[PDB]
Design an enzyme around this catalytic site. Sequence first.
Site, PDB file in Angstrom:
ATOM      1  N   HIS D  12      45.286  27.513  41.206  1.00 19.56           N
ATOM      2  CA  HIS D  12      46.084  26.812  42.234  1.00 19.56           C
ATOM      3  C   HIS D  12      47.464  26.288  41.837  1.00 19.56           C
ATOM      4  O   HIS D  12      48.244  25.896  42.702  1.00 19.56           O
ATOM      5  CB  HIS D  12      45.261  25.659  42.789  1.00 19.56           C
ATOM      6  CG  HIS D  12      44.004  26.119  43.431  1.00 19.56           C
ATOM      7  ND1 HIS D  12      43.999  26.837  44.615  1.00 19.56           N
ATOM      8  CD2 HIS D  12      42.714  26.064  43.025  1.00 19.56           C
ATOM      9  CE1 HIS D  12      42.765  27.165  44.918  1.00 19.56           C
ATOM     10  NE2 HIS D  12      41.961  26.705  43.971  1.00 19.56           N
ATOM     11  N   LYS D  41      39.445  37.689  47.087  1.00 27.43           N
ATOM     12  CA  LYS D  41      39.239  36.288  47.427  1.00 27.43           C
ATOM     13  C   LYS D  41      39.963  36.046  48.724  1.00 27.43           C
ATOM     14  O   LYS D  41      41.159  36.305  48.818  1.00 27.43           O
ATOM     15  CB  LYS D  41      39.761  35.361  46.338  1.00 27.43           C
ATOM     16  CG  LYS D  41      39.492  33.908  46.633  1.00 27.43           C
ATOM     17  CD  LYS D  41      40.113  32.998  45.585  1.00 27.43           C
ATOM     18  CE  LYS D  41      39.399  31.659  45.532  1.00 27.43           C
ATOM     19  NZ  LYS D  41      39.998  30.742  44.505  1.00 27.43           N
ATOM     20  N   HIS D 119      38.710  21.423  42.409  1.00 32.17           N
ATOM     21  CA  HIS D 119      38.527  22.300  43.556  1.00 32.17           C
ATOM     22  C   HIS D 119      39.598  21.980  44.593  1.00 32.17           C
ATOM     23  O   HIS D 119      39.970  20.825  44.781  1.00 32.17           O
ATOM     24  CB  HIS D 119      37.097  22.166  44.136  1.00 32.17           C
ATOM     25  CG  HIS D 119      36.954  22.624  45.562  1.00 32.17           C
ATOM     26  ND1 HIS D 119      36.679  23.931  45.908  1.00 32.17           N
ATOM     27  CD2 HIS D 119      37.037  21.937  46.733  1.00 32.17           C
ATOM     28  CE1 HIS D 119      36.607  24.033  47.225  1.00 32.17           C
ATOM     29  NE2 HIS D 119      36.831  22.837  47.750  1.00 32.17           N
ATOM     30  N   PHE D 120      40.131  23.014  45.226  1.00 30.20           N
ATOM     31  CA  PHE D 120      41.126  22.831  46.273  1.00 30.20           C
ATOM     32  C   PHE D 120      40.410  22.949  47.611  1.00 30.20           C
ATOM     33  O   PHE D 120      39.742  23.940  47.886  1.00 30.20           O
ATOM     34  CB  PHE D 120      42.247  23.849  46.132  1.00 30.20           C
ATOM     35  CG  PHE D 120      43.414  23.619  47.069  1.00 30.20           C
ATOM     36  CD1 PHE D 120      44.576  22.990  46.618  1.00 30.20           C
ATOM     37  CD2 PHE D 120      43.362  24.059  48.389  1.00 30.20           C
ATOM     38  CE1 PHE D 120      45.654  22.773  47.471  1.00 30.20           C
ATOM     39  CE2 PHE D 120      44.441  23.856  49.244  1.00 30.20           C
ATOM     40  CZ  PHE D 120      45.592  23.202  48.784  1.00 30.20           C
TER      41      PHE D 120
HETATM   42  N1  C3P Z   1      43.305  25.766  52.182  1.00 35.64           N
HETATM   43  C1  C3P Z   1      42.405  26.347  51.281  1.00 35.64           C
HETATM   44  C2  C3P Z   1      41.003  26.431  51.611  1.00 35.64           C
HETATM   45  C3  C3P Z   1      40.183  27.015  50.666  1.00 35.64           C
HETATM   46  N2  C3P Z   1      40.710  27.456  49.500  1.00 35.64           N
HETATM   47  C4  C3P Z   1      39.877  28.146  48.491  1.00 35.64           C
HETATM   48  O1  C3P Z   1      38.691  28.583  49.129  1.00 35.64           O
HETATM   49  C5  C3P Z   1      37.688  28.634  48.119  1.00 35.64           C
HETATM   50  C6  C3P Z   1      36.368  28.283  48.710  1.00 35.64           C
HETATM   51  O2  C3P Z   1      36.638  27.755  49.977  1.00 35.64           O
HETATM   52  C7  C3P Z   1      38.072  27.567  47.046  1.00 35.64           C
HETATM   53  O3  C3P Z   1      37.896  28.097  45.828  1.00 35.64           O
HETATM   54  P1  C3P Z   1      37.619  26.745  44.520  1.00 35.64           P
HETATM   55  O4  C3P Z   1      36.380  26.020  45.040  1.00 35.64           O
HETATM   56  O5  C3P Z   1      37.497  27.685  43.338  1.00 35.64           O
HETATM   57  O6  C3P Z   1      38.995  26.091  44.707  1.00 35.64           O
HETATM   58  C8  C3P Z   1      39.595  27.268  47.290  1.00 35.64           C
HETATM   59  O7  C3P Z   1      40.308  27.845  46.248  1.00 35.64           O
HETATM   60  C9  C3P Z   1      42.150  27.371  49.225  1.00 35.64           C
HETATM   61  O8  C3P Z   1      42.599  27.789  48.185  1.00 35.64           O
HETATM   62  N3  C3P Z   1      42.968  26.780  50.158  1.00 35.64           N
END
Ligand code: C3P
Lengths: 124, 124, 124, 124
Positions: D12, D41, D119-120
């Site tokens: 991210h 992804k 986590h994002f």
């Molecule tokens: N606005 C968003 C919503 C979800 N996500 C990504 O969606 C994935 C699962 O929803 C997440 O992986 P992590 O849990 O590895 O960040 C997150 O990276 C994102 O990167 N931006």
Amino acid sequence: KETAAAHFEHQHMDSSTSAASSSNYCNQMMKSRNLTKDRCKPVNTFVHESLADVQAVCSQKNVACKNGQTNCYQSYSTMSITDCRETGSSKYPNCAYKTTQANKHIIVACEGNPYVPVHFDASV
Amino acid sequence: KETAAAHFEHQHMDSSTSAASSSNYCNQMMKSRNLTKDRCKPVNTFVHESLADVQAVCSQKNVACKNGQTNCYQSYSTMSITDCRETGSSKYPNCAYKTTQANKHIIVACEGNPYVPVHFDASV
Amino acid sequence: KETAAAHFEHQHMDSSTSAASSSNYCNQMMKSRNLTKDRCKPVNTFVHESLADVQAVCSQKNVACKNGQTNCYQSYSTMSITDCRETGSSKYPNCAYKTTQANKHIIVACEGNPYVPVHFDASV
Amino acid sequence: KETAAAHFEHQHMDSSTSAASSSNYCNQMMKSRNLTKDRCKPVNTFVHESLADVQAVCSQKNVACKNGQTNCYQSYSTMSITDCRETGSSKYPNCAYKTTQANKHIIVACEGNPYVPVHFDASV
Ligand SMILES: Nc1ccn([C@@H]2O[C@H](CO)[C@@H](OP(=O)(O)O)[C@H]2O)c(=O)n1
Ligand SMILES: Nc1ccn([C@@H]2O[C@H](CO)[C@@H](OP(=O)(O)O)[C@H]2O)c(=O)n1
Ligand SMILES: Nc1ccn([C@@H]2O[C@H](CO)[C@@H](OP(=O)(O)O)[C@H]2O)c(=O)n1
Ligand SMILES: Nc1ccn([C@@H]2O[C@H](CO)[C@@H](OP(=O)(O)O)[C@H]2O)c(=O)n1
């Protein structure tokens, strides 16, 4: 007397207490919040969380309301709620309720500025 | 014509699975059961139990229906259900649904001879 | 104290009479079986049938118990029973009980090895 | 494999550019950061900010996570982010992304000691 938001906290908010204890709950609270003055309200949920936590549901998961409108929101987390369901006997004025404590997602309708709950759709 | 009884089964019975297999269950089922024909039904519950066990609810805990009628009955046991709730962005005829699998008590309305479910009131 | 099966026998079996002989049947029974020694048990049913007959119900119609467990069984045939609620004219220890005599299907919870009644759930 | 926070960084953070420089930023970056190795992804956000600024969000506005946990945090200020989303014609191993540049508050899940983003969750 009274805004939609005020009406919502009136019928659905009780932060005074954390959970349900005795099955007299709905029995007593349905009477208190003036929900059994005209007819036994069949179903009513009370939310045991801060007003801020419930209001914040208005920026969480957008979902359709029961009537098909799309201004409803489900809380991301479980909340402490008490589901009040009128019993099979139960005759007005002597309204009787099955008190049920649980931890469910709630779904509320949101509108206005500030963007707050105005109806309680469902618990899930 | 159609019997309310059969209409109930059509909309709410799924005895073939013990649970929802994926998060796409509802999207699949809401269309295959033709509940998204004229409109996106905002809320619909499917029950993963035998027809006998669901029909048997009709002799279990008597409660008030959401509309105040008294022919509703709550299952004594929790049952395997799937709550299908239309997404906020869902637009007819491309209807989309959140899926929530859970073990919950069901509340059905019952009528007739044989005395069987004809409406799905709520899950609690 | 008692085994589960023995507890059921002592509380619910009465094969010594065809029925409640008086409006105060419960009151000599609620005493004779020590149901009114530390309280007045609100509800208690006496089954005027054979223990074997009653035990056989454990292999008749499986139905959901009131508590949500699923080890309950309804008799195919009716049975002579006595329903004991207590008259308003009753405060412990001077117990008085409202008696009622009838032929009903009984619902019992069963368990163990041998599979025998351990709890009386309802008469229907 | 990497540790939580490191995974977050690798997935991210793009502190080297102020913004997506082209419509194809995501296609190259999703490739570069190895986010297309086993699958395309479906969505991934890159934040054009310093790391510490992002970590500092762990100490800003506490909000509910989409999974319903409580360790999510919303940034007081908007941040330069690139939204990357699979484009429809995208098909593994030929993934394809729509690049969208914006100024939004990020929401992230934080944990550990030190309390860091792992986590994002969303951009608001
Ligand atoms: N606005 C968003 C919503 C979800 N996500 C990504 O969606 C994935 C699962 O929803 C997440 O992986 P992590 O849990 O590895 O960040 C997150 O990276 C994102 O990167 N931006
Ligand atoms: N689960 C439910 C279902 C209905 N209800 C109540 O019963 C009504 C639904 O008919 C709602 O009115 P509002 O939506 O106006 O609050 C709500 O008060 C509830 O409180 N919980
Ligand atoms: N919890 C809920 C709420 C509504 N519903 C469906 O939404 C409809 C309108 O309330 C109901 O129609 P019947 O109750 O006539 O089946 C029921 O089918 C449901 O299936 N589960
Ligand atoms: N019809 C009924 C309903 C309840 N009861 C009594 O009510 C009590 C609590 O529900 C039960 O005690 P056991 O559970 O020890 O049988 C049962 O004895 C009864 O004896 N007949």
